[PDB]
Amino acid sequence: AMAAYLCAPAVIHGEHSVETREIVEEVRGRHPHAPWAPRIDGIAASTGIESRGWMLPLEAAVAPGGGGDLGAAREALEQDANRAIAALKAVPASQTVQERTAPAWEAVQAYGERAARGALQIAGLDVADVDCLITSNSTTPALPGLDVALANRLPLRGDTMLLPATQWACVAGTRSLALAADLVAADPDRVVLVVISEALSTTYQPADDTLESLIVRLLFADTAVAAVVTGRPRPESVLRLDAAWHHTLPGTRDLHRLETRADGTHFVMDRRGPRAVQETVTAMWEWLRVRYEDDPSSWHPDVLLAHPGGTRVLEYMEQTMPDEWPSGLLSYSRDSYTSGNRGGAAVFDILRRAHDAGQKTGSRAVLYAAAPGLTATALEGEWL
Amino acid sequence: AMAAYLCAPAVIHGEHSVETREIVEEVRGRHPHAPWAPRIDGIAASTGIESRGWMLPLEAAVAPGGGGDLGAAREALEQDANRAIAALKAVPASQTVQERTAPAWEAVQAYGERAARGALQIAGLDVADVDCLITSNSTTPALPGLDVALANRLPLRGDTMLLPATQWACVAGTRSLALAADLVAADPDRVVLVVISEALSTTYQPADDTLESLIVRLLFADTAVAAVVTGRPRPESVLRLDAAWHHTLPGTRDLHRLETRADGTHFVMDRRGPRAVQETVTAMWEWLRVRYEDDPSSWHPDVLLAHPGGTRVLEYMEQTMPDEWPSGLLSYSRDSYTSGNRGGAAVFDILRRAHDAGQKTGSRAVLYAAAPGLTATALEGEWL
């Protein structure tokens, strides 16, 4: 029913390495008097992250944006009034949404373009071979978006099928593979290119004050990844997708939200979020079990590329695994998190780390990812 | 190669009717001294629009949002300082992006939910029959978006395939039909539900000053539409899709843009935009011609559901039509524009007006739409 082939992904991390000590040090500087103050060495140490890559330097986020009409305020309120307006402008203002977005939107296009070309080289293809383009980009408001940018820069054929998304977030790594599978099913001669470019650092907001704000600042890293899916096997084909699985939890939309305020984009996380995704992990084990119910006990997942959102739920996955399964399945996933949470680009990154480590032809593979709204998508496959 | 069946669309306009005289009158009030002032009765009269429907009242856009820390500014600058801050707060501030979005996001979910249920009733289906959901929503930043909202409210099955988009804009009416076609091709038993919900009035910005600003205020209307596509014909099936066509113009990304500023969403239009879409209309005539080149001259489009973006390019379409073709093809399209430009919801709305008017089984149909970035998607079909 479902047959789709996947060449190895191309991963391109953020060039601006931001030390976790630089963030801890920076936020301490931002808010001197705070209740979370003692929690810092404690909270930061639990992440297990020394440093991450960004598409922009920490300065690009923390810096003051300023900019305000002022003249209208001055007029509405002679020489004494001018000194008053200058006294108000001197105060450092946060960056407006367009100020945070502009440079990030540029980085996204650039990193995405690189990853796109990388993906095509790995597949051994030409830019003109691409028939359908799928893009995923969440934290940098743009219309037209990454898809039209790519079709211009690569470039792609004028008749390429453009399929941009912005609300997939963390599930892009599996939802786009599931989608690509369907496209190459409608036409096996199709060449689908998936590009996930995320400047997640756009969520780093210096002003916010929360036990969770610190966690949002420390969690995410920037990346652009890409991969080719085809309806017919290629020597460059690394993995074959056999089934897709979707699961959405009713009444959990507000656990992970991305709010777009006048000062950029905010990612608010409810403490029960992980607990909610644990549900989708159970749902998945059940999916796999029911699918290998008739089949002999021989069937067994040799590779697990999972993206629950954190090490915590990763630990939970290791303990929920049926009977006796290999211990180092979440090795690649865990290795990925130590560099940061790459959201929509996480799955590919993990697939890359798995690939770069060396896999055996025939290895049973499972790709998994959970995302805001609390919806998840899993794929079962076979390594080639 | 491509076989997809489409039940009649459900259209649900904005309940808040805004008279064009109310907008003309309002903007005159906003900007007393202006160069465009004499152009008003002239410019507004060319639109051919008496009034439009909105998901919110004109007041919801024009109203002042206010809201500002203030305390920090006061502290940074006793009783005299307090009177100064109160003197600054008295000035009417524009609404912040979250203030413009919040109520619109609510209207979008509601109108979309209604149109979704309507679409399912027209198809004679149950909410649990839906296998894939496609949503399109451009002017109201939300993550999770309309897709998860719908899966909760309808509700849909936990395993429904969610496919949300926000950057499709005006092309959603054809890009989602093309996409739906591919999905039901991968699995003909599939039931795809498309929902396009747009609060385009979110772009109405009282402050902006441009010959084009007036045009942006006067052009768009709010709508939520929905339709069911299946891989197998149903008694409710109204139209059958046979082919899909895509076309993107290189180096034209900046003609129609949607910028997300701190005070909401802005839609900037370059004067050469229509001239650019004329290109895609030619490209399309050529597509159809090349496709009916071998076939006898008998082949002839009996229904033309087109959405170039305005009456101007509509006139151009009427004059570019090969040989002798029926005069009232753009009748339904033109009828649609007199009520406003519904963007992504335009095509369905036009398909509805065509349907409500009565069509003959066998009528050759063509669906067309152009959208920002300057990309277009056309579909050729046969009425049932």
mmCIF file of N, CA, C and O in Angstrom, chain A residues 39-91:
data_model
loop_
_atom_site.group_PDB
_atom_site.id
_atom_site.type_symbol
_atom_site.label_atom_id
_atom_site.label_comp_id
_atom_site.label_asym_id
_atom_site.label_seq_id
_atom_site.Cartn_x
_atom_site.Cartn_y
_atom_site.Cartn_z
ATOM 1 N N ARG A 39 17.977 28.548 41.045
ATOM 2 C CA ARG A 39 17.685 27.376 40.230
ATOM 3 C C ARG A 39 18.574 27.255 38.995
ATOM 4 O O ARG A 39 18.517 26.256 38.284
ATOM 5 N N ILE A 40 19.403 28.258 38.741
ATOM 6 C CA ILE A 40 20.064 28.342 37.444
ATOM 7 C C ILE A 40 21.087 27.235 37.178
ATOM 8 O O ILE A 40 20.964 26.499 36.201
ATOM 9 N N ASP A 41 22.090 27.115 38.041
ATOM 10 C CA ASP A 41 23.086 26.063 37.879
ATOM 11 C C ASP A 41 22.416 24.697 37.931
ATOM 12 O O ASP A 41 22.883 23.737 37.316
ATOM 13 N N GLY A 42 21.312 24.620 38.665
ATOM 14 C CA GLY A 42 20.576 23.379 38.801
ATOM 15 C C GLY A 42 19.781 23.052 37.554
ATOM 16 O O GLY A 42 19.883 21.953 37.012
ATOM 17 N N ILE A 43 18.988 24.015 37.096
ATOM 18 C CA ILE A 43 18.154 23.830 35.915
ATOM 19 C C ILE A 43 18.988 23.628 34.654
ATOM 20 O O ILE A 43 18.721 22.726 33.862
ATOM 21 N N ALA A 44 19.995 24.474 34.470
ATOM 22 C CA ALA A 44 20.832 24.409 33.279
ATOM 23 C C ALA A 44 21.605 23.097 33.196
ATOM 24 O O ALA A 44 21.899 22.611 32.106
ATOM 25 N N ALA A 45 21.933 22.526 34.350
ATOM 26 C CA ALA A 45 22.725 21.303 34.393
ATOM 27 C C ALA A 45 21.914 20.076 33.987
ATOM 28 O O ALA A 45 22.474 19.062 33.568
ATOM 29 N N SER A 46 20.595 20.172 34.107
ATOM 30 C CA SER A 46 19.724 19.046 33.790
ATOM 31 C C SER A 46 19.523 18.881 32.287
ATOM 32 O O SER A 46 19.170 17.799 31.817
ATOM 33 N N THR A 47 19.749 19.953 31.533
ATOM 34 C CA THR A 47 19.572 19.908 30.084
ATOM 35 C C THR A 47 20.584 18.981 29.419
ATOM 36 O O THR A 47 20.284 18.346 28.407
ATOM 37 N N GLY A 48 21.780 18.906 29.992
ATOM 38 C CA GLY A 48 22.841 18.084 29.437
ATOM 39 C C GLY A 48 23.412 18.671 28.162
ATOM 40 O O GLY A 48 23.962 17.953 27.327
ATOM 41 N N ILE A 49 23.279 19.986 28.015
ATOM 42 C CA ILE A 49 23.725 20.681 26.814
ATOM 43 C C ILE A 49 24.847 21.666 27.125
ATOM 44 O O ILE A 49 24.649 22.632 27.863
ATOM 45 N N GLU A 50 26.025 21.415 26.557
ATOM 46 C CA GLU A 50 27.165 22.311 26.713
ATOM 47 C C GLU A 50 27.008 23.545 25.836
ATOM 48 O O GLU A 50 27.227 24.670 26.283
ATOM 49 N N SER A 51 26.627 23.325 24.583
ATOM 50 C CA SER A 51 26.428 24.421 23.644
ATOM 51 C C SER A 51 25.580 23.992 22.451
ATOM 52 O O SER A 51 25.429 22.799 22.183
ATOM 53 N N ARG A 52 25.033 24.971 21.739
ATOM 54 C CA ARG A 52 24.189 24.703 20.580
ATOM 55 C C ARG A 52 24.573 25.595 19.406
ATOM 56 O O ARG A 52 25.275 26.591 19.576
ATOM 57 N N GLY A 53 24.112 25.232 18.213
ATOM 58 C CA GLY A 53 24.317 26.053 17.037
ATOM 59 C C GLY A 53 23.113 26.937 16.771
ATOM 60 O O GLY A 53 21.976 26.516 16.952
ATOM 61 N N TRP A 54 23.371 28.170 16.350
ATOM 62 C CA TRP A 54 22.314 29.111 15.997
ATOM 63 C C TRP A 54 22.588 29.698 14.620
ATOM 64 O O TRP A 54 23.732 29.734 14.169
ATOM 65 N N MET A 55 21.534 30.164 13.957
ATOM 66 C CA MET A 55 21.679 30.835 12.672
ATOM 67 C C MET A 55 22.033 32.301 12.887
ATOM 68 O O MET A 55 22.421 33.000 11.951
ATOM 69 N N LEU A 56 21.896 32.757 14.129
ATOM 70 C CA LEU A 56 22.265 34.118 14.506
ATOM 71 C C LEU A 56 23.004 34.106 15.841
ATOM 72 O O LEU A 56 22.864 33.164 16.616
ATOM 73 N N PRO A 57 23.803 35.150 16.114
ATOM 74 C CA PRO A 57 24.519 35.216 17.393
ATOM 75 C C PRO A 57 23.579 35.603 18.527
ATOM 76 O O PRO A 57 22.608 36.318 18.286
ATOM 77 N N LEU A 58 23.863 35.137 19.740
ATOM 78 C CA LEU A 58 23.031 35.452 20.898
ATOM 79 C C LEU A 58 22.691 36.938 20.950
ATOM 80 O O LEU A 58 21.609 37.323 21.390
ATOM 81 N N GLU A 59 23.624 37.767 20.490
ATOM 82 C CA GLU A 59 23.443 39.214 20.480
ATOM 83 C C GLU A 59 22.241 39.645 19.639
ATOM 84 O O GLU A 59 21.554 40.608 19.973
ATOM 85 N N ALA A 60 21.992 38.928 18.550
ATOM 86 C CA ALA A 60 20.893 39.260 17.650
ATOM 87 C C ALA A 60 19.529 39.146 18.330
ATOM 88 O O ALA A 60 18.551 39.747 17.884
ATOM 89 N N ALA A 61 19.469 38.372 19.409
ATOM 90 C CA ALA A 61 18.224 38.177 20.145
ATOM 91 C C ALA A 61 18.118 39.132 21.332
ATOM 92 O O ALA A 61 17.098 39.794 21.524
ATOM 93 N N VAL A 62 19.186 39.195 22.120
ATOM 94 C CA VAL A 62 19.209 39.999 23.337
ATOM 95 C C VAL A 62 19.238 41.503 23.053
ATOM 96 O O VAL A 62 18.672 42.294 23.809
ATOM 97 N N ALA A 63 19.889 41.889 21.961
ATOM 98 C CA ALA A 63 20.049 43.300 21.610
ATOM 99 C C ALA A 63 18.740 44.079 21.665
ATOM 100 O O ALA A 63 17.671 43.519 21.442
ATOM 101 N N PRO A 64 18.826 45.380 21.972
ATOM 102 C CA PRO A 64 17.659 46.267 21.967
ATOM 103 C C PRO A 64 17.302 46.668 20.546
ATOM 104 O O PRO A 64 18.196 46.945 19.751
ATOM 105 N N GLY A 65 16.013 46.700 20.230
ATOM 106 C CA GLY A 65 15.577 47.061 18.895
ATOM 107 C C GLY A 65 15.302 48.545 18.765
ATOM 108 O O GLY A 65 15.546 49.145 17.717
ATOM 109 N N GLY A 66 14.795 49.140 19.838
ATOM 110 C CA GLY A 66 14.433 50.544 19.821
ATOM 111 C C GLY A 66 13.482 50.848 18.682
ATOM 112 O O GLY A 66 12.789 49.960 18.185
ATOM 113 N N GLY A 67 13.452 52.106 18.260
ATOM 114 C CA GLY A 67 12.567 52.517 17.188
ATOM 115 C C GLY A 67 11.164 52.816 17.682
ATOM 116 O O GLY A 67 10.446 51.925 18.135
ATOM 117 N N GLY A 68 10.779 54.083 17.594
ATOM 118 C CA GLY A 68 9.456 54.518 17.998
ATOM 119 C C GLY A 68 9.164 55.884 17.416
ATOM 120 O O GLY A 68 10.041 56.748 17.391
ATOM 121 N N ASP A 69 7.939 56.079 16.938
ATOM 122 C CA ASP A 69 7.557 57.338 16.307
ATOM 123 C C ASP A 69 8.114 58.529 17.083
ATOM 124 O O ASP A 69 8.882 59.325 16.542
ATOM 125 N N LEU A 70 7.721 58.638 18.348
ATOM 126 C CA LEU A 70 8.242 59.666 19.248
ATOM 127 C C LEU A 70 7.770 61.075 18.892
ATOM 128 O O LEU A 70 7.232 61.787 19.739
ATOM 129 N N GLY A 71 7.977 61.475 17.640
ATOM 130 C CA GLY A 71 7.573 62.791 17.181
ATOM 131 C C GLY A 71 6.112 63.082 17.461
ATOM 132 O O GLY A 71 5.750 64.198 17.835
ATOM 133 N N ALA A 72 5.267 62.071 17.279
ATOM 134 C CA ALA A 72 3.839 62.208 17.535
ATOM 135 C C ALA A 72 3.568 62.398 19.024
ATOM 136 O O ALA A 72 2.683 63.158 19.412
ATOM 137 N N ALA A 73 4.337 61.697 19.851
ATOM 138 C CA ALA A 73 4.202 61.807 21.298
ATOM 139 C C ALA A 73 4.691 63.168 21.783
ATOM 140 O O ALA A 73 4.075 63.786 22.650
ATOM 141 N N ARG A 74 5.803 63.625 21.217
ATOM 142 C CA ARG A 74 6.362 64.926 21.564
ATOM 143 C C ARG A 74 5.384 66.042 21.217
ATOM 144 O O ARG A 74 5.099 66.910 22.042
ATOM 145 N N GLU A 75 4.870 66.008 19.992
ATOM 146 C CA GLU A 75 3.921 67.012 19.525
ATOM 147 C C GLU A 75 2.662 67.032 20.386
ATOM 148 O O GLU A 75 2.114 68.096 20.677
ATOM 149 N N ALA A 76 2.209 65.851 20.795
ATOM 150 C CA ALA A 76 1.006 65.729 21.608
ATOM 151 C C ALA A 76 1.243 66.193 23.043
ATOM 152 O O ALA A 76 0.296 66.380 23.809
ATOM 153 N N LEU A 77 2.508 66.379 23.402
ATOM 154 C CA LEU A 77 2.866 66.807 24.750
ATOM 155 C C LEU A 77 3.563 68.166 24.740
ATOM 156 O O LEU A 77 2.996 69.170 25.170
ATOM 157 N N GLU A 78 8.416 73.429 24.996
ATOM 158 C CA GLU A 78 9.102 73.167 23.736
ATOM 159 C C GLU A 78 10.413 72.420 23.962
ATOM 160 O O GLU A 78 10.483 71.204 23.785
ATOM 161 N N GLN A 79 11.448 73.158 24.352
ATOM 162 C CA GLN A 79 12.763 72.574 24.594
ATOM 163 C C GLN A 79 12.721 71.561 25.733
ATOM 164 O O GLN A 79 13.499 70.606 25.758
ATOM 165 N N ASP A 80 11.809 71.775 26.675
ATOM 166 C CA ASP A 80 11.665 70.885 27.821
ATOM 167 C C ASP A 80 11.006 69.577 27.397
ATOM 168 O O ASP A 80 11.333 68.508 27.914
ATOM 169 N N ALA A 81 10.077 69.671 26.452
ATOM 170 C CA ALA A 81 9.389 68.496 25.931
ATOM 171 C C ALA A 81 10.345 67.622 25.127
ATOM 172 O O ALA A 81 10.244 66.396 25.144
ATOM 173 N N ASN A 82 11.274 68.264 24.425
ATOM 174 C CA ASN A 82 12.265 67.549 23.630
ATOM 175 C C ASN A 82 13.203 66.720 24.502
ATOM 176 O O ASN A 82 13.606 65.620 24.126
ATOM 177 N N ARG A 83 13.546 67.258 25.668
ATOM 178 C CA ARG A 83 14.411 66.557 26.610
ATOM 179 C C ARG A 83 13.673 65.386 27.247
ATOM 180 O O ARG A 83 14.288 64.407 27.669
ATOM 181 N N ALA A 84 12.350 65.497 27.313
ATOM 182 C CA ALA A 84 11.517 64.440 27.873
ATOM 183 C C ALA A 84 11.426 63.246 26.925
ATOM 184 O O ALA A 84 11.490 62.094 27.355
ATOM 185 N N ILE A 85 11.279 63.531 25.635
ATOM 186 C CA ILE A 85 11.205 62.485 24.620
ATOM 187 C C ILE A 85 12.543 61.763 24.484
ATOM 188 O O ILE A 85 12.586 60.552 24.269
ATOM 189 N N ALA A 86 13.631 62.517 24.608
ATOM 190 C CA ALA A 86 14.969 61.941 24.552
ATOM 191 C C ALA A 86 15.235 61.104 25.798
ATOM 192 O O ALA A 86 16.036 60.169 25.771
ATOM 193 N N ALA A 87 14.559 61.449 26.889
ATOM 194 C CA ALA A 87 14.691 60.711 28.139
ATOM 195 C C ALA A 87 13.956 59.377 28.060
ATOM 196 O O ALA A 87 14.295 58.428 28.768
ATOM 197 N N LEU A 88 12.950 59.312 27.193
ATOM 198 C CA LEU A 88 12.171 58.091 27.016
ATOM 199 C C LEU A 88 12.802 57.177 25.969
ATOM 200 O O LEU A 88 12.720 55.953 26.072
ATOM 201 N N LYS A 89 13.433 57.775 24.964
ATOM 202 C CA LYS A 89 14.082 57.009 23.905
ATOM 203 C C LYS A 89 15.345 56.319 24.413
ATOM 204 O O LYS A 89 15.749 55.282 23.887
ATOM 205 N N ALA A 90 15.959 56.898 25.439
ATOM 206 C CA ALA A 90 17.190 56.355 26.004
ATOM 207 C C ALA A 90 16.975 54.964 26.597
ATOM 208 O O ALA A 90 17.888 54.139 26.611
ATOM 209 N N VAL A 91 15.765 54.711 27.086
ATOM 210 C CA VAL A 91 15.424 53.407 27.647
ATOM 211 C C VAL A 91 15.439 52.329 26.566
ATOM 212 O O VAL A 91 14.854 52.505 25.496
#
